[PDB]
Design a protein around this nucleic acid. Structure first.
Ligand SMILES: [Zn+2]
Lengths: 204, 99, 80, 128, 148, 60, 113
RNA sequence: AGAACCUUACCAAAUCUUGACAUCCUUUGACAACUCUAGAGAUAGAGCCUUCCGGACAAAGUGACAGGUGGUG
RNA sequence: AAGUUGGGCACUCUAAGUUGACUGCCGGUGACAAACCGGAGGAAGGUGGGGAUGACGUCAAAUCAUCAUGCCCCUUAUGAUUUGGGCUACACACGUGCUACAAUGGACAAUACAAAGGGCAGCGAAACCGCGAGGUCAAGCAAAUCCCAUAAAGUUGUUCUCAGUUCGGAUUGUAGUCUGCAACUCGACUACAUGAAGCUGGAAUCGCUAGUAAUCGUAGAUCAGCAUGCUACGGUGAAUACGUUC
């Protein structure tokens, strides 16, 4: 019923996560990127991998991993980054160059907050306290607005419902607004619990 | 004695900046450039059924627009050719050179 | 296929099976699933058990049956 | 020479219209107007700006027109003629504006909406 | 549920006769946008009536419309009764042309030009189907004259 | 889609006309675009995520 | 009367020829041109020699009873061989692979509610 | 947003039981693009025979396992 | 022959950056307002036209058959491979459409004017072969260049002359073309021949306020082949709105 804000804003004030051009092997390149992203997500679950950007030029693949824990991905001796690069080169015939971008405030990143709340739900925390503290810390860190929602079999009840908490401004109809949105799923013993988070850090 | 450069990109911003960069490089290398010439943009429209099941009457319309830019180099020089071949454009834009 | 420049279609296995025992007058019944095979003059006087979906309907080939497909004499659907 | 150039647009029809001192003859794409346009109503619409400005027969018109159909091209030519008369004499601005001939008719063909047979026509509805 | 009244369109005069009424009659006759067919049909009908009457086509057509144009109609109001009410001049022209064309299309002639010519001639003589329609409208308005 | 069905689509067909397209992300056989090799649903999801270069919501 | 069937006196010659079974507009035109007769001329206002030439051209076109008998023989052959087309002819259903769930009236007759 | 085969789940017949498909464990090196016989085909039987980097990738057996467009919107 | 090329970038056009409409300005109203009515200029005047964008919630509304998943069930079978069938059945009822019932028309002859799209082993010109669907060879083109691709309705003439017809083109026979391995179940198209119902549709019921309705064609996705469907494009182009009691 509500348009995905990322989908609404892509190409207006938000750039694509895949930056390249093709005319003949568009499908091959797209699915190469998809499998690369799936591999990165499966391999860096523990790391706070906010997102990944993929570009390609001169038969090379530039990967930019925006994460909140660059130490885990790089490694103390830079061994983890080299291992990831080698695995990606093995998977894809092309040559891959990987960069890591630090996120200073992981609590203002929609995806990181969504994954954190989903992890707490899997650990069987309180679906109300988790959202309350998440919104509190996001708001105290200077966010102009934040909205959190969790839906499913909340406390294990037979009847599934959804609950949300807001604070500040989340103008989903403003196309100017740079609203970050994320959805995550917790695999609780009762089933899938869907968490959604919207963050609006203000005009930029 | 002309050299054609065809740039194609999904973003008019990136295509314009790349065209300006290559024009500046050619002018620095000395050759004379006529352009940039903006060729018509090619827009491909995709119509998807919004719902996963039934609900034929609700659709969503996406588009892919590729902008096209043309550059003509009139007085080529080895320096101009070397500079053009060594210049690195952003990954978004696709460049084709016809000598 | 249908176009004249291409010869009338017929399964190679079916054609060779029919050609087998051509000299002998004790021609037997040929089980076939090839509803798509064309009927050549060579088939006249033969008995083909043609699969119609669940069972092989026997069909006896005569001169007037030349040019039709083996499926035209093995109905697939049942009504009343 | 003494050419008065102008451009007119209507629907998808663009007409480059030149006015020269003449006897009132109009040539469109190297063809006579009364042969190019299937109806005399279109010719009268073309002449309408001349009637308003009160300079009927004082100019010969040369038209390079493409796009649209015959009515669209006729009205694009009329717009071009009005603009050319403006260029020739600014004193005709009041008369042309009062006649409403300087306005570029903004009406275009509305897009088709998804889920509808046409721009507005919707599928036949049937309760039950 | 309506903010107000919308501006009305203004058609151009007939190219040969220079008559807004002739232009509007052409628009009425036109079907599926075949403006040319409408124009040729109307001009042929005008020529036929001119030939058969020896009088100006515009004059006879004006007489016909004057004969088939109503003055009163019966519009329901409410406890609910139809009330006679004067007809606006533009409703007069609209109804005259509409009835003229509608009852022309029902005539027994072979071609629409013949049908329209005969209908305008009968209306000018005050003995046509459109005339009958106007007469019925006027008498029922008189019948309900009390409620005015 | 069924895993066996996807495997059979991926495997080589003895004939050549017997080849059909499936969405390579989920396996849906219907409404699969050639340019992306994706079904409409996966296409919409990835366009929303912004992972299809140059594919943005259209309006005109 | 050409080919043993009377043809409309009023009609033009070609349109009257079409009334002969097995004659269609293309073959009426071919016959009329082979036998040099004007298309405009009506059959009633037609020369005896012209009529004779028309008959001579027509006789070799395999029309009327011969054509009807040939078609009936073909239909009987396909019925007798027990073909799918023959079975559908016998049952009065569409023969050329139409759908009978709906829209089969031209073969099934009027609706039997 | 494309039912002659495929799509295709439903049905008849012919068929397989670590399996059409994923990883792991044992062991081998070519695993085979090509051909020929029976087959409606899957398949099976003869050829053959060429390809492979600590070590690639691929096959023979068994078990963890796989598989389900099966049910509950 | 041809913007065909020499020559030009004036005009059109393409597309980046900008100007542009904001109740800005002037009259009356109005509570010193907010707003309304009119006028000027202006391509556009009062959110200009159209799109995207759909609040808290309702219907335990739809989807375990896109995908994912709690729980249950089968594991030499509810799993799996293959040839054939079925999904196209047919006494029938309903919805949505295409073509018609004709003279504002049918046939034939000549002759104008668009937009938006697609093309790699794909789009396929020219020519020649056939009545035609198409075939032979083969030019141009990874595109503002070549091709799909000549728009049709339209205009101007000849003819028919009010009827189941020169309307209509369903059904059927014969002869073919193409794609595909293969068109019987079960593809499209062409030629010859046949020539069904149908003479404007009961109760009832639907869409639309302008470049709209109606009408005419054009292109694309899916696709080896197959469109009256869907999604887009333009050509011609109406009638009407008194008004808000129902
Ligand atoms: Zn998918």
């Amino acid at each position: 019923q509500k348009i995905n804000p990322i989908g609404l804003r892509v190409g207006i004030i938000r750039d694509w996560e895949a930056k390249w051009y093709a005319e003949k092997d568009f499908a091959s390149l797209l699915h190469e990127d998809l499998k690369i992203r799936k591999f990165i997500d499966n391999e860096l679950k523990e790391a706070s991998v906010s997102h990944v950007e993929i570009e390609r030029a001169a038969n090379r693949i530039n990967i930019a991993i925006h994460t909140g824990k660059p130490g885990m991905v790089i490694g103390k001796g830079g061994s983890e980054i080299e291992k990831l690069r080698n695995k990606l080169n093995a998977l894809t015939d092309k040559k891959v160059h990987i960069n890591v971008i630090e996120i200073k405030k992981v609590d203002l990143d929609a995806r990181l907050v969504a994954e954190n709340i989903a992890r707490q739900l899997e650990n069987r925390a309180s679906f109300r306290r988790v959202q309350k503290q998440a919104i509190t810390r996001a708001m105290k860190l200077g966010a102009k607005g934040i909205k959190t929602q969790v839906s499913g079999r909340l406390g294990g009840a037979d009847i599934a419902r959804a609950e949300q908490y807001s604070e500040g401004t989340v103008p989903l109809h403003t196309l100017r607004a740079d609203i970050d949105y994320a959805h995550a799923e917790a695999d609780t013993t009762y089933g899938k619990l869907g968490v959604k988070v919207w963050i609006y850090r203000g005009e930029v | 004695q002309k050299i054609r450069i065809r740039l194609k990109a999904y973003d008019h911003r990136v295509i314009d900046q790349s065209a300006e960069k290559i024009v500046e490089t050619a002018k620095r290398s000395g050759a004379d450039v006529s352009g940039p010439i903006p060729l018509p943009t090619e827009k491909s429209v995709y119509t998807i059924i919004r719902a996963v099941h039934k609900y034929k009457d609700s659709r969503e319309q996406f588009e892919q627009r590729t902008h096209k830019r043309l550059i003509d180099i009139v007085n080529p020089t080895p320096k101009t050719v070397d500079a053009l071949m060594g210049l690195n454009l952003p990954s978004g834009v696709d460049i084709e050179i016809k000598l | 296929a249908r176009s004249i420049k291409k010869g009338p279609f017929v399964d190679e296995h079916l054609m060779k099976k029919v050609e087998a025992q051509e000299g002998s007058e004790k021609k037997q019944v040929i089980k076939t699933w090839s509803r798509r095979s064309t009927i050549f003059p060579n088939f006249i006087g033969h008995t083909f058990a043609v699969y119609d979906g669940r069972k092989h309907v026997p069909v006896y080939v005569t001169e007037d049956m030349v040019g039709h497909k083996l499926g035209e004499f093995a109905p697939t659907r049942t009504f009343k | 020479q003494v050419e008065y150039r102008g451009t007119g647009r209507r629907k998808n029809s663009v007409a480059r219209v030149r006015l020269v001192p003449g006897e009132g003859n109009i040539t469109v794409n190297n063809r006579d107007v009364r042969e190019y346009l299937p109806f005399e109503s279109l010719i009268l619409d073309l002449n309408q700006p001349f009637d308003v400005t009160e300079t009927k027969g004082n100019y010969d018109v040369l038209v390079n027109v493409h796009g649209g159909g015959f009515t669209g091209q006729a009205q694009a030519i009329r717009h071009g003629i009005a603009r050319a008369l403006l260029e020739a004499d600014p004193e005709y601005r009041g008369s042309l504006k009062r006649a409403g001939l300087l306005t570029r008719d903004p009406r275009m063909k509305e897009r088709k909406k998804p889920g509808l047979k046409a721009a507005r026509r919707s599928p036949q509805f049937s309760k039950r | 549920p309506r903010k107000g009244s919308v501006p009305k369109r203004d058609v151009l005069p007939d190219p040969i006769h220079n008559s807004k009424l002739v232009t509007k009659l052409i628009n009425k006759i036109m079907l599926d946008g075949k403006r040319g067919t409408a124009q040729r049909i109307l001009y042929s009908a005008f020529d036929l009536v001119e030939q058969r009457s020896g009088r100006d086509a515009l004059e006879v057509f004006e007489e016909a419309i004057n004969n088939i144009m109503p003055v009163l109609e019966v519009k329901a109001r409410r406890s609910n009764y139809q009330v006679p009410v004067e007809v606006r001049p533009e409703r007069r022209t609209t109804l005259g042309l509409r009835w003229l064309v509608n009852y022309a299309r029902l005539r027994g002639e072979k071609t629409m030009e013949d049908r329209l010519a005969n209908e305008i001639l009968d209306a000018a003589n005050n003995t046509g189907g459109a005339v009958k329609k106007r007469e019925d409208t006027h008498k029922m308005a008189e019948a309900n004259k009390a409620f005015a | 889609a069924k895993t066996s069905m996807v495997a059979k689509q991926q495997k080589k067909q003895k004939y050549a006309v017997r080849e059909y397209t499936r969405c390579e992300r989920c396996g849906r056989p219907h409404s699969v675009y050639r340019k992306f090799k994706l079904c409409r649903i996966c296409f919409r999801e990835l366009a929303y995520k912004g992972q299809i270069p140059g594919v943005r919501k259209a309006s005109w | 009367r050409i080919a043993g069937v009377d043809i409309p006196r009023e009609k033009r010659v070609v349109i009257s020829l079409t009334y002969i079974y097995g004659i269609g507009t293309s073959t009426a035109q071919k016959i009329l041109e082979e036998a040099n007769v004007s298309a405009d001329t009506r059959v009633k206002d037609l020369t005896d020699d012209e009529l004779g030439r028309i008959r001579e051209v027509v006789d070799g076109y395999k029309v009327e009873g011969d054509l009807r008998r040939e078609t009936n023989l073909n239909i009987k052959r396909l019925m007798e061989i027990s073909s799918y087309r023959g079975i559908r002819h016998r049952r009065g259903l569409p023969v050329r692979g139409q759908k009978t769930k709906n829209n089969a009236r031209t073969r099934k007759g009027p609706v039997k509610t």
